[PDB]
Amino acid sequence: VSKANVPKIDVSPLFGDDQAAKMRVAQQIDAASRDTGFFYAVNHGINVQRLSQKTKEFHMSITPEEKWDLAIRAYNKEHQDQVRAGYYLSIPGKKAVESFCYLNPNFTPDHPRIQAKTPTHEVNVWPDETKHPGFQDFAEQYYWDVFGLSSALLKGYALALGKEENFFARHFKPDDTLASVVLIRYPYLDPYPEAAIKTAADGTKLSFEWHEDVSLITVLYQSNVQNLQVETAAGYQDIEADDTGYLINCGSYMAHLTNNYYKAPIHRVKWVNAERQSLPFFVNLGYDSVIDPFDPREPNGKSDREPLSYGDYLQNGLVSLINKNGQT
Numbered sequence: 001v002s003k004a005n006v007p008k009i010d011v012s013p014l015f016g017d018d019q020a021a022k023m024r025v026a027q028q029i030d031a032a033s034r035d036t037g038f039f040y041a042v043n044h045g046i047n048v049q050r051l052s053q054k055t056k057e058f059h060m061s062i063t064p065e066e067k068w069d070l071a072i073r074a075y076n077k078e079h080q081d082q083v084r085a086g087y088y089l090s091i092p093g094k095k096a097v098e099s100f101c102y103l104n105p106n107f108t109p110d111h112p113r114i115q116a117k118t119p120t121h122e123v124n125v126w127p128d129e130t131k132h133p134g135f136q137d138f139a140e141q142y143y144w145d146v147f148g149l150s151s152a153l154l155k156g157y158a159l160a161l162g163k164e165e166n167f168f169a170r171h172f173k174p175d176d177t178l179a180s181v182v183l184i185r186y187p188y189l190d191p192y193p194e195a196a197i198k199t200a201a202d203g204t205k206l207s208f209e210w211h212e213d214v215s216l217i218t219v220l221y222q223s224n225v226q227n228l229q230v231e232t233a234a235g236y237q238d239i240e241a242d243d244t245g246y247l248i249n250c251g252s253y254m255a256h257l258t259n260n261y262y263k264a265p266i267h268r269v270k271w272v273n274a275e276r277q278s279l280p281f282f283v284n285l286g287y288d289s290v291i292d293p294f295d296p297r298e299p300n301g302k303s304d305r306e307p308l309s310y311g312d313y314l315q316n317g318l319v320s321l322i323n324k325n326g327q328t
């Protein structure tokens with residue numbers, strides 16, 4: 001099995017005012033986006049050591065009682081309004097992975113989208129402060145940190161495509177973004193449940209099958225355990241781990257709006273029996289956000305693709321991924 005070319009891109013110029021330097025960053029984003037579709041963002045400014053430490057303390061201290069109280073409706077029939085946000089339970093002997101998902105901290109009972117009961121919008125559920133002191137404050141602060149990184153990356157993608165730097169970012173707003181953080185625990189287990197291992201067509205043991213991401217872009221932290229593979233025409237290639245950087249790739253909404261000029265890379269998660277963390281931030285826009293598709297390969301940029309509302313995209317995409325690859 002070969003190794004994918006995943007460049008490390010210093011994204012620090014995207015936080016600054018040196019326009020030529022931002023253009024050199026954009027060129028590197030463009031080149032990675034048209035090759036394997038992945039790159040590591042380095043010099044990103046986020047304290048990933050603290051992220052990893054506070055996530056670990058959470059995963060290792062939460063109890064079965066608390067997991068039921070936080071569970072999404074797939075695991076608790078009482079929580080009919082928790083489709084996205086809350087706890088995704090493991091099943092001993094059957095399902096190894098478990099995770100906690102939270103959304104925009106600004107979705108409160110008073111928020112107009114929550115009052116209108118708009119699909120894909122939910123109010124976050126949190127554990128008890130006295131049992132997990134500081135966890136919610138940390139988690140909400142992390143949301144806005146990674147929001148800020150993601151904003152800057154979106155300026156890079158816009159410049160890469162020949163657009164003004166706010167082309168995407170203007171639709172990525174603290175008041176209405178559907179972006180989510182997921183804090184995923186992949187446990188070490190001995191014996192490891194066979195039901196939690198999937199076998200690929202090519203014989204590879206997997207934790208999660210091939211997919212395109214449901215996102216504009218995906219901004220991922222992982223601990224230093226190799227697990228991801230990306231599909232190329234010549235087969236799947238291993239993505240090397242780097243627990244100092246954020247791994248970035250496009251989701252299928254970027255592919256839609258660029259007429260597949262920036263493909264959403266197909267990737268999958270290999271089975272590794274190792275205790276690790278996978279902490280994606282899915283960059284979603286607002287429910288009513290629509291970006292007119294264009295084709296950068298054409299002088300005039302004309303595209304025949306229909307504009308697609310981000311809310312409709314996301315609603316269908318999340319369900320399709322569950323149907324295709326299973327409830328996580």
Ligand SMILES: CC(C)[C@@H](NC(=O)[C@H](CS)NC(=O)CCC[C@H](N)C(=O)O)C(=O)O
Pocket residue numbers: 084085101179180182184208211213214218220269278279280282318321328
């Ligand atoms: C590879 C990582 C991104 C991670 N995979 C994942 O998180 C997988 C594939 S991209 N993603 C999902 O299941 C979508 C979760 C969406 C979330 N519930 C929400 O409501 O917004 C993993 O480690 O399995």
